[PDB]
């Protein structure tokens, strides 16, 4: 006979604003306010403004503000037509909310309003709805995901050493990452990661090398080869008291598009040797024998589907093979990859697809096919820690959200801490069995 | 005849946990829950575990966790004795809440529980009380400070280039900062900061120098002298389209105690020249004639009070002289400095004193003497942005919260943006006139 305020979940006000990301570039933040008084606030990390296969964030291109990277247009979209089309809709109907935005932008790649406008409102909606339902976001997400009460704390792959285009060094591989698979909780995992990271700083200082950090919070020291990169990591893991293999495994992102040139893969820091697809695969395979590298991301160019079919054949039974640039969080590409035996894992970048509902759909397609889904950060992040709730609420099982420095990264580890505290063993931390290719 | 929930401001529960700061080290986070349903959550930045003049945070020293820097004991103090002494107290009585934690800790320097446990609770409490009072934190802080509805947006001093002990280079000065005094809003100031910061990266790339960032998000390139550090700042400012002097002024931190040996200041990147106090003060004077440096922090050693009395006589009319190490946010030391004409400004580190009530008293003592208070970050920060609300609610007029990268820094900038959105001209951005020594 009385209606609680929780039931007044119609949207009455949406606000957008230009805030700053962790590289100092603008991004969009939205607030969704419901009739009952509930508020959700979320921000989109940085994305791509150009590209033929993914959703595009909208940038102003005004040279007199932020070197052309203002997001006043995306923000005006949130404040004007997005808001106007969502006022009076039920925030609890996440899929209806996202559909209205998707249909109103009217393009395939969200370029009218920007994936940045649309994601920010999608997630702020979701938080506002969570609040109206009387529940934390990870619980709402699990409900929206069709998996109520089903949770896991994800195994993190933590950036530690950078190379390629992300460093002045002679390391070809773009990043090396550690995964604390022997931890029994995410809180333990985070601590092991921190300990290794601090021991690596000591290793690097003793070699006369720089310990300043890149975008993701890891080190980009002047290492002489791929081998020296892996050696300093092994040395730091041992100095922290852990055992490579059993406690900590390695993951990499080759970004192999960056060294692809005339159908060959060319590695500056191995004498400028050229490799065919296949020879590059054998090169990577040789690294997996010397070091317990269990996950390899973008190990060939996004166009090299014949080569990815080969690599997946050779390495796929024992090694997680993660499509980042391969799939760009695009389910039409993932679908076809699945049908053709291409990779066995996908990096999920929610602003590359641009709405919460579509993100859940991408994670589900992965999971139904036996692929793993790794929830990912971007280069430009914010304070916002929504990807932690996403990973728990979908039981994704893995996350890639940075080194253990910079609060753009660490706010996510902290949120995973707060989540596990509340959930305990209702969110098990499963360790190496999350990783495709293990048992 | 009906009592609203907001009147139910008694503390019913306090929760402490160990989370991770921006360098990967543990810190304390607290949540204060009130009877009416209000919750405030806050984290303490990293501080000192040792020292004889300041409040000390409490680290575990268990070498098997976080290289000895766990804060499980500080966390236990929150969950047990602090919680039990506060259940049933009125969170709106900030001074009383703080007084109970101080008296129960029972030491002069907060070493039993830790300044980390105390501050975290103190701020969580203030946020819970703000919610019970129906107001944002900046409004509540202003009421606690004795200055209801009086606000300003602070002029930021932004870390841009690091030297001394914070870099491998030949820059003796620990940091150079830019101040966008020409902006009319803190939103514009922030944008100017960004643009200068991005132009500086392009200048450093063209010179073949490293653009990876330190703790505060600025650069530590291998520059050969203090002159060169100042030249690349000048060049970046010009490439961004601003004018040194009018639009952007410079602030520095010598941390002169790092080169103070046998009563003399010994500067590596100046031939290794030795200087008396008096000569070092005339060396700084000359920099202030050659470049628009309007603020100098710790221009002499903390023990050199005769020196600081001389530097203040000479520079103090025209230059802001900021005590950091000199005062360590300790009102006993500040009062004595004020009586002896020592410096004209103070860096406020709220975790160095350890409570919100004493932080307000520090700022008041500075302002009543005509000193300026610059609200400060620490080297290990979190996502928490309370220092932004603090600066606005005390009308401090200046803030030192980092470069324009890393969300540990940029979260504060974002919060200043949200505050100025809501307040507009009720929070004037006063520019150059906030700075001690300007007309
Ligand atoms: Mg990649
Ligand atoms: Mg200093």
From Swiss-Prot, chains A, B:
Q: Which domain of life is it from?
A: Bacteria
State the CDD domains in the record.
enolase
Pathway(s) this gene product operates in, as recorded in its UniProt entry:
Carbohydrate degradation; glycolysis; pyruvate from D-glyceraldehyde 3-phosphate: step 4/5
Q: Give any single GO term for biological process.
A: glycolytic process
Keyword presence, Secreted: yes
Question: What keywords would UniProt list here?
Answer: Cytoplasm, Glycolysis, Lyase, Magnesium, Metal-binding, Secreted
Catalyzed reaction equations: (2R)-2-phosphoglycerate = phosphoenolpyruvate + H2O
Please name the catalytic residues of this protein.
216 (proton donor), 349 (proton acceptor)
Q: What is its main location?
A: cytoplasm
Q: What cofactor(s) does the depicted protein rely on?
A: Mg(2+)
Q: Where in the cell is it found?
A: Cytoplasm; Secreted; Cell surface
- Cite the EC number: 4.2.1.11
Q: Does the keyword Magnesium apply?
A: yes
> Which PROSITE patterns does UniProt cross-reference here?
ENOLASE
- What NCBIfam families does the annotation carry? eno
Quaternary state and interactors: Component of the RNA degradosome, a multiprotein complex involved in RNA processing and mRNA degradation.
Name the chain's protein: Enolase
